Amino acid sequence: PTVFHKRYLKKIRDLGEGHFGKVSLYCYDPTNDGTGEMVAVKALKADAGPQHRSGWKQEIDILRTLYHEHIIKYKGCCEDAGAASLQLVMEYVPLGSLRDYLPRHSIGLAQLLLFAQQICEGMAYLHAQHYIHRDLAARNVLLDNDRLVKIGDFGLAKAVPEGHEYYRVREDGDSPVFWYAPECLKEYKFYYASDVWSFGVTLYELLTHCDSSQSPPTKFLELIGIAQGQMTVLRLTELLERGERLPRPDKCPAEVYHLMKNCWETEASFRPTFENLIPILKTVHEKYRH
Numbered sequence: 001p002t003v004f005h006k007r008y009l010k011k012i013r014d015l016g017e018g019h020f021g022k023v024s025l026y027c028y029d030p031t032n033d034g035t036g037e038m039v040a041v042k043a044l045k046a047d048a049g050p051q052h053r054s055g056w057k058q059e060i061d062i063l064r065t066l067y068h069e070h071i072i073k074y075k076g077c078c079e080d081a082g083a084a085s086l087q088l089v090m091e092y093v094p095l096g097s098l099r100d101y102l103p104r105h106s107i108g109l110a111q112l113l114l115f116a117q118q119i120c121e122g123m124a125y126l127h128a129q130h131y132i133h134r135d136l137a138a139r140n141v142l143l144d145n146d147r148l149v150k151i152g153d154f155g156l157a158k159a160v161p162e163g164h165e166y167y168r169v170r171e172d173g174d175s176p177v178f179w180y181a182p183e184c185l186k187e188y189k190f191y192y193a194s195d196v197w198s199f200g201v202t203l204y205e206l207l208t209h210c211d212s213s214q215s216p217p218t219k220f221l222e223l224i225g226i227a228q229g230q231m232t233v234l235r236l237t238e239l240l241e242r243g244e245r246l247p248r249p250d251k252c253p254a255e256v257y258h259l260m261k262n263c264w265e266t267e268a269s270f271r272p273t274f275e276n277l278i279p280i281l282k283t284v285h286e287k288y289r290h
């Protein structure tokens with residue numbers, strides 16, 4: 001509901017880009033003294049078409065209705081006269097995403113399992129609100145402090161109508177295919193269980209400290225090959241249907257890899273829900289903590 005006046009917004013730096021969104025760091029200082037809050041402002045590029053504009057409206061509408069300790073905090077909106085739409089104002093998390101933080105900070109196993117438990121808590125809340133995230137990846141998991149994680153980026157999020165188990169989307173170039181379950185790839189159907197598959201991929205990213213050489217696109221493309229014409233998604237669907245999976249990260253405990261593999265069941269109903277994962281991850285974190 002809050003309205004931020006463009007008048008008092010001072011750009012500090014960009015945090016994320018590019019086609020078709022941009023996240024920037026601003027100081028919102030109405031007193032003009034410097035005591036003003038630091039905010040992360042997400043803007044829709046003025047060049048964006050109707051499809052991305054109706055989607056952006058949905059992203060703001062969804063984030064506005066969500067309230068959870070593991071979901072990025074919505075602060076309000078700013079009128080972007082130049083766009084012309086709304087700029088999404090949210091809390092700024094200094095440590096950034098796990099994708100940017102982990103390659104530079106060796107975090108212990110216990111802490112990574114805590115982040116994974118918190119991701120499941122935030123996701124179970126999201127699923128109880130009858131929404132699917134559709135872009136669950138380490139790049140979209142923001143770190144508030146060494147012990148606290150927050151899910152962001154609701155750009156692909158959708159409301160799943162009551163009584164329905166899935167939502168159908170179309171063939172898109174920006175689809176994060178390397179984080180997607182086979183039902184999404186082959187039938188274009190996104191179930192609550194499809195987000196669980198993406199969590200298994202996110203859990204794999206965390207256990208690899210988001211190392212680029214071990215990332216899901218890197219590993220799947222080494223399996224698929226780069227001279228496949230328009231067939232990368234087809235070869236991906238085929239390798240997953242044959243039971244091939246991302247490997248066990250170095251130092252990942254066997255039980256944790258088995259949990260990962262269970263999130264990667266080909267049959268969507270054989271996967272645990274986020275509600276089932278919470279006590280499991282609480283127990284595993286407790287085992288590994290010291």
Ligand SMILES: Nc1ncnc2c1ncn2[C@@H]1O[C@H](COP(=O)(O)OP(=O)(O)O)[C@@H](O)[C@H]1O
Nearest residue numbers: 015016021023040091092093096097139153155
């Ligand atoms: N609240 C925030 N605080 C700090 N960095 C953020 C915040 N929101 C986003 N970012 C950074 O900007 C990147 C892009 O933001 P995101 O919402 O995921 O946009 P996109 O839809 O283009 O992927 C994130 O991966 C992260 O690096």
Ligand SMILES: [Mg+2]
Nearest residue numbers: 135139140153
């Ligand atoms: Mg993102």
Ligand SMILES: [Mg+2]
Nearest residue numbers: 135153155156
């Ligand atoms: Mg996004």
